[PDB]
Symmetry: C2
Subunit: 139 residues, 2 copies
């Protein structure tokens, strides 16, 4: 492949395209949200390539889910996740947002198209997981 | 260094080489076929390799708490599932275990607690987006 800068450039260009596709008037606060989230993920000690790819993949799934009307529900859960009581309640709502984004990927005709190939192509994968699950049982 | 694919595959291989030798070859085969599947999903090769290395990191941490047996059975059940919806439900169960291993990790929970106290900056901007959306 290429360098870390090439991955970050391509992914951040993808994110910027997602922000340009939002109604003007939201792009300012959306630009601010991208800045602090990247800052927060940087203070996590997480490598910048991992954080940028997480941001880019979530942003792509936020755009797809917004096209099917789920942006209102996702923003509501994002508020509850950050205002929750403890850490364990945050992840619970985090996994709830991830579910809606994943099901919106299944509602997308092209996303369901590729999600079915992910299911079929896994045929060679089940046997190997079965093969070593059997080996782990003997251990 | 200039090639993150070289860096990621070096990280992935060191996980496989340190695994019990009885599973070495079967893990290598799983690695090659998973990379074949991700490329078929329209994912760039540089991102597919990176996406295989970061998940392998979480698999190593979750295996330290005895969760590798559950994750493999969930992976088998998700692939042999009936519909796409059920496969997504089982995949979310795998993600629940991933987040649980991060919370059980000492440094992971420390940084996870940093979010419950650094989220305040992110709420005020998304509430601004919420208020602007409730207008329309």
């Amino acid at each position: 492949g290429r360098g870390s800068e090439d991955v970050i450039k391509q992914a951040l260009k993808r994110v910027q395209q997602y922000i340009q596709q939002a109604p003007n008037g939201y792009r300012d606060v959306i630009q601010q949200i991208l800045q602090t989230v990247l800052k927060i993920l940087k203070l996590m000690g997480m490598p910048e390539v991992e954080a940028v790819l997480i941001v880019a993949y979530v942003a792509e799934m936020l755009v797809l889910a917004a096209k099917y009307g789920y942006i209102d529900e996702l923003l509501k859960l994002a508020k509850e996740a950050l205002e929750a009581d403890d850490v364990d309640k945050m992840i619970e709502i985090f996994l709830k947002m991830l579910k809606i984004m994943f099901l919106a990927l299944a509602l997308d005709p092209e996303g369901l198209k590729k999600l079915k190939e992910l299911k079929k192509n896994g045929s060679e994968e089940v046997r190997k997981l079965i093969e070593e699950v059997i080996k782990q049982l003997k251990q």
